[PDB]
Amino acid sequence: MRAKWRKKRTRRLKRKRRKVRARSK
Amino acid sequence: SGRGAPLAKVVFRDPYKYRLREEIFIANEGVHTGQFIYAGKKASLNVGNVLPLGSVPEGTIVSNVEEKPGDRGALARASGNYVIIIGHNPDENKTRVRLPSGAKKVISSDARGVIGVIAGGGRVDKPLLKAGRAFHKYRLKRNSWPKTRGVAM
Amino acid sequence: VVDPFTRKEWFDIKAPSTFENRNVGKTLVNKSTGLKSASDALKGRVVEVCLADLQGSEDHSFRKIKLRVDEVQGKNLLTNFHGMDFTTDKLRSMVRKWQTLIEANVTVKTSDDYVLRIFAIAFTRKQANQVKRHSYAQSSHIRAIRKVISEILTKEVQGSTLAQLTSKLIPEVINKEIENATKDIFPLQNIHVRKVKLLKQPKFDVGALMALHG
Amino acid sequence: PKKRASNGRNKKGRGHVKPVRCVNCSKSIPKDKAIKRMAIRNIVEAAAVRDLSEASVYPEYALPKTYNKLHYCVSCAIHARIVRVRSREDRKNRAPP
Amino acid sequence: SINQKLALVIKSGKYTLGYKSTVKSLRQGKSKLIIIAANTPVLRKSELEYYAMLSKTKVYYFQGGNNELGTAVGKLFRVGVVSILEAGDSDILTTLA
Amino acid sequence: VLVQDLLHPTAASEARKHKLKTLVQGPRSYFLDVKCPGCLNITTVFSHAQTAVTCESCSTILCTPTGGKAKLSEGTSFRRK
Amino acid sequence: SQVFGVARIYASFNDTFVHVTDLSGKETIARVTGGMKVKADRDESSPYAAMLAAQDVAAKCKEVGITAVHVKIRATGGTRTKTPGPGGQAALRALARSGLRIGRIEDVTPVPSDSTRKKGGRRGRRL
Amino acid sequence: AKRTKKVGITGKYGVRYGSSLRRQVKKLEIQQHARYDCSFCGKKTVKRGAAGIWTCSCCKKTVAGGAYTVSTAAAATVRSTIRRLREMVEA
RNA sequence: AGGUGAAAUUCUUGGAUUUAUUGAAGACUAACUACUGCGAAAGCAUUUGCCAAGGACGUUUUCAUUAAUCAAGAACGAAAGUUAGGGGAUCGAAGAUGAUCAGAUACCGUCGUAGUCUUAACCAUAAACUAUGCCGACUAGGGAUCGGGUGGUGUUUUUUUAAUGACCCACUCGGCACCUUACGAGAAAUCAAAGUCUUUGGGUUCUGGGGGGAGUAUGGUCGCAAGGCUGAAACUUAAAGGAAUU
Incomplete structure (x- = not known):
């Protein structure tokens, strides 16, 4: 697997972890 | 007071009688209360001045121009709007010009074309903010506001 | 179908009196119709050609003199000087490599208050001693070429219009005027004025209209 | 690993300068770090050249030329163009042939 | 250079900033310079132009400003007309303009 | 390389290199004694000079600022040292 | 003294514009492209x-006599x-091979x- | 005691309406209020005397500029073109 | 006709493609364009006025330790991405689809919004590269190449010995890359620095330590957001990585 594809897969699940995180603000 | 640009009383001591009738040449984003203006097909291309398009060039910007050489000014009279020229013709006088309706129309090279746009840099690009400057807004226009909804009644 | 060959009048075109042979070449306007005679048909046409076949020496097989038809005289379209140009084919022919291209521009008015703009092209060459494979300049010298090219051009013009100015353009007397002040500086090869364009001319003046007929 | 002096091509101590897109597959890349070759094409070709001079008007004419400048993309320029993959020290090669 | 001339004669020269004083220096006979830039009213200077021929003095119309002609006089204040009285250092009586 | 003597110098490497790389600092230039046609007094000047050295009563600028040695006119005498 | 004019022929990829005009240019003479004889398109700028x-x-x-x-x-x-055009210069090989005085080639x-x-x-x- | 971090002359619009809206406000507000330079004197001491005008206190000549700014992005590229034609017909 | 390897799309009796006469916004600065420039970096190639700056060297110039490199800090910062005024000329994420093969979101086709650039200001990040730190002296030759200093009734020039500019010649400090081996070093590759490191210390900025997990959890500070610097641990596993060889 290309490193840019692996770097973005986690960038999306990192911005997505800011979403389920908005459930505590 | 009721429009959206500095309209001026352009004085003329009358070319046939001694009485100064301050005629009226609309707003130009680049003038001052004290300009030695010239109007007529034989004047200079200085903003404020004016001559028929048979004395002007391809790609010029002016205001209060007549679609019918004499209307005193129809096209080119808006806060932040202008009129460029897209073509010309020495015979028949068919100088094509740029109007914001997304299209362009042809005029005659004898219509009075007063150099310069109407003053008012970016009005619909600086919000009402509150219906306040919005109520005092329709104050000098028409009671078309407030506008209700159809699905409603 | 109408086979326009009929309304395809095999006309003809010639030169003025400022050149040598008043023969340029035949053309095809359109047969005289209703409210479109064979005088005020086109008139805005042009004659683009190398001044070699326009004169008599194949040394000038380069450079293309630009003309524009005025109106018809003797059922033979005349012509007049609208400007001078350089062959696009000879432009890429004079460009070698390992050098520097020195160009310049300048707007000028004539005596008849004619608005044109003479330019000037320039290529670089070595010296009868140099061993260098380039022959570049310290820029402050190429920048001096621009203040000297415009100096020359706008010092002799503003007189006799392009009638006498074009009378010196063709015999390329400027190639020895450019290489005149440059002789005391850098050698330079080729050296020509390239282009120049005219667009600020009034309307049809019957005056210089018969000055083309001879 | 790294096999070349100014890797790219004469790319040393400057960076972004002025690039020119490829005049083949439209593959863009810097002019001073790619590859370029002058085109010395006459006017016609090598076969019908004699038949054109026979019909040529004017005393044999002077006959001018039409030059040009090429720009390659590297990837396609190696498909079967100018390259053919070279050897080690013969890589330092900066000679015409 | 017009920069060198200005700098020197204004850091050691007898001058007069102003309409009255320019009119007073004019109706004295010891003023040979009066430079007004393009932004200041040339009307006040119209009497000075009608007085240019009356004062016989050699004027000069600088293509700049009296805020840039302020750097020329010294303070970042406002001064459209610079009228030279008596020589104190340099003599722009004859320059490259 | 191997062996030499940077203790005893030569006249060849004394008129070729910079005094700032040899063994001691020293100007490769000099001053001059140039006069003008009509000066019955004295005139001592520099080499490159930089700034232009004028005259006495008939100031006709002896030399002007040059990248090389302050050039002299047709009314002067290049007097070395 | 001849019957002058300017060919001004064109030759791009997937077609070849084979026609002539006059020294003026504001009037052409004939057009005729190469794919008008070939009904396959596979070979358009072909020989x-x-x-x-x-x-x-x-x-x-x-017919014009120029x-x-x-x-x-x-x-x-x-x-x-x-x-x-790769095979678009084969147009000069056939017009000279039939007759047509050419000069001032540019x-x-x-x-x-x-x-x-x-x-x-x-x-x-990249494909 | 500047009672602002990122609001300025817009804090007078508190929590009502919205941030985004009031943001752009302060933009041309400042490029209208501020004593604009009167080129008819080179001395900047002329503010906005009603929509589209700049009342000058330097010869007291009122000025015709912009609705907020003294020259919008549009009438700017236009300042150029009119200058261009001027010379061509000049001499 | 535009178009590909050939197709289809599409534009075409509503005369587009076609060459010629003035135009225009928007964009660019071509070919010369180089083992070269100058700039702090990022980079930034047309002309001229203005603004001033830096610089090599010139100098028997003025100072007299002014000094030397950086944690937190402080200016610019290409390009993507941004808020909005001016902005889509082309190309053109996305999209729309015509072929392709069992299938194709894609590559190849045409068109096409964001984007493309600007005004004052944000996100301060990249293979931002020399994957290789700054300076003060030394260890090699030639020069490729620029700025510069010298002498030459030297080359070229003719106006008129003067003024002369440029080219030629060894030399040549600050610069920019290369060649031969390497005295040295280096895992090798290779390097006038990766030499001057077991014979290890000239002042100093910084970071790295088997790799996954993971530049992810947390929080702080910055920013509008995307996201930036940031920074875990358990658990797992005995291989992984690099040079170079067959």
């Missing part, structure tokens, strides 16, 4: 295409291949300042 191209323009120039023509051919110029393909972006970009058009 016999240009041959048959200057074949349809050969007898039509014999012979001395200052040709101004072209590749594609503008901002595309910048390369002349070109007018305008080269850009790389101004308007070309159709390719960084990664380009």
Whole structure:
């Protein structure tokens, strides 16, 4: 697997972890 | 007071009688209360001045121009709007010009074309903010506001 | 179908009196119709050609003199000087490599208050001693070429219009005027004025209209 | 690993300068770090050249030329163009042939 | 250079900033310079132009400003007309303009 | 390389290199004694000079600022040292 | 003293414009392209295409009577291949092989300042 | 005691309406209020005397500029073109 | 006709493609364009006025330790991405689809919004590269190449010995890359620095330590957001990585 594809897969699940995180603000 | 640009009383001591009738040449984003203006097909291309398009060039910007050489000014009279020229013709006088309706129309090279746009840099690009400057807004226009909804009644 | 060959009048075109042979070449306007005679048909046409076949020496097989038809005289379209140009084919022919291209521009008015703009092209060459494979300049010298090219051009013009100015353009007397002040500086090869364009001319003046007929 | 002096091509101590897109597959890349070759094409070709001079008007004419400048993309320029993959020290090669 | 001339004669020269004083220096006979830039009213200077021929003095119309002609006089204040009285250092009586 | 003597110098490497790389600092230039046609007094000047050295009563600028040695006119005498 | 004019023939990729005009240019004479003889399109800027191209323009120039023509051919110029038609020069091989006085041979393909972006970009058009 | 971090002359619009809206406000507000330079004197001491005008206190000549700014992005590229034609017909 | 390897799309009796006469916004600065420039970096190639700056060297110039490199800090910062005024000329994420093969979101086709650039200001990040730190002296030759200093009734020039500019010649400090081996070093590759490191210390900025997990959890500070610097641990596993060889 290309490193840019692996770097973005986690960038999306990192911005997505800011979403389920908005459930505590 | 009721429009959206500095309209001026352009004085003329009358070319046939001694009485100064301050005629009226609309707003130009680049003038001052004290300009030695010239109007007529034989004047200079200085903003404020004016001559028929048979004395002007391809790609010029002016205001209060007549679609019918004499209307005193129809096209080119808006806060932040202008009129460029897209073509010309020495015979028949068919100088094509740029109007914001997304299209362009042809005029005659004898219509009075007063150099310069109407003053008012970016009005619909600086919000009402509150219906306040919005109520005092329709104050000098028409009671078309407030506008209700159809699905409603 | 109408086979326009009929309304395809095999006309003809010639030169003025400022050149040598008043023969340029035949053309095809359109047969005289209703409210479109064979005088005020086109008139805005042009004659683009190398001044070699326009004169008599194949040394000038380069450079293309630009003309524009005025109106018809003797059922033979005349012509007049609208400007001078350089062959696009000879432009890429004079460009070698390992050098520097020195160009310049300048707007000028004539005596008849004619608005044109003479330019000037320039290529670089070595010296009868140099061993260098380039022959570049310290820029402050190429920048001096621009203040000297415009100096020359706008010092002799503003007189006799392009009638006498074009009378010196063709015999390329400027190639020895450019290489005149440059002789005391850098050698330079080729050296020509390239282009120049005219667009600020009034309307049809019957005056210089018969000055083309001879 | 790294096999070349100014890797790219004469790319040393400057960076972004002025690039020119490829005049083949439209593959863009810097002019001073790619590859370029002058085109010395006459006017016609090598076969019908004699038949054109026979019909040529004017005393044999002077006959001018039409030059040009090429720009390659590297990837396609190696498909079967100018390259053919070279050897080690013969890589330092900066000679015409 | 017009920069060198200005700098020197204004850091050691007898001058007069102003309409009255320019009119007073004019109706004295010891003023040979009066430079007004393009932004200041040339009307006040119209009497000075009608007085240019009356004062016989050699004027000069600088293509700049009296805020840039302020750097020329010294303070970042406002001064459209610079009228030279008596020589104190340099003599722009004859320059490259 | 191997062996030499940077203790005893030569006249060849004394008129070729910079005094700032040899063994001691020293100007490769000099001053001059140039006069003008009509000066019955004295005139001592520099080499490159930089700034232009004028005259006495008939100031006709002896030399002007040059990248090389302050050039002299047709009314002067290049007097070395 | 001849019957002058200017060929101004064109030759791009996937077609070859084989026609002549006059020294003025504001009037052309004939058009006839090479794919008009070939009903396959597979071979458009092909060799016999240009041959048959200057074949349809050969007898039509014999109708006007013009012979001395200052040709101004072209590749594609503008901002595309910048390369002349592969088999589009076979049009000169058939018009001279039939008869037509040629002289003042030149070109007018305008080269850009790389101004308007070309159709390719960084990664380009790699297939 | 500047009672602002990122609001300025817009804090007078508190929590009502919205941030985004009031943001752009302060933009041309400042490029209208501020004593604009009167080129009819080179001395900047002229503010906005009603929509589209700049009342000058330097010869007291009122000025014709912009609705907020003294020259919008549009009438700017236009300042250029009129200058261009001027000379061509000049001499 | 535009177009590909050939197709299809599409534009075409509503005369586009076609060459010629003035135009225009928007864009660019071509070919010369180089083992070269100058700039702090990022980079930034047309002309001229203005603004001033830096610089090599010139100098028997003025100072007299002014000094030397950086944690937190402080200016610019290409390009993507941004808020909005001016902005889509082309190309053109996305999209729309025509072929392709069992299938194709894609590559190849045409068109096409964001984007493309600007005004004052944000996100301060990249293979931002010399994957290789700054300076003060030394260890090699030639020069490729620029700025510069010298002498030459040297080359070229003719106006008129003067003024003369440029080219030629060894030399040549600050610059920019290369060649031969390497005295040295280096895992090798290779390097006038990766030499001057077991014979290890000239002042100093910084970071790295088997790799996954993971530049992810947390929080702080910055920013509008995307996201930036940031920074875990358990658990797992005995291989992984690099040079170079067959």
